[PDB]
Symmetry: C2
Subunit: 67 residues, 2 copies
Amino acid sequence: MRTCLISPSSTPQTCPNGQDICFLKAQCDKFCSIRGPVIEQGCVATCPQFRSNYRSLLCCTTDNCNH
Amino acid sequence: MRTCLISPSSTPQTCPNGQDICFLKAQCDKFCSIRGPVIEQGCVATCPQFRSNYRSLLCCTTDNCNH
């Protein structure tokens, strides 16, 4: 069913079977002071658990909602 | 220190000690199409779990990011 925006181009793509949630994740690694968070967009079966190094995490259930 | 928006007024509120995450949950009633999801915003210690009636869940760690 679901189509989501995918990294790195933020282009809409069909989700793999069993993954009906779109996500947008901004996470800081050891290099956040050099280049800021890495942005990841994709499909998931379950909204990921929030981590202490996430600037933000959006999970949503409308097509291409993860922007 | 963390400040988050609180529903329904989009009011910035100082989070209590131990709550460093702002969240926005968009949750649908049984009939959602006319008025859209109910938007709940606040401070929280841990990002909430995603539920079967959620159109979106956002967790973030910058002041007033939960919009």
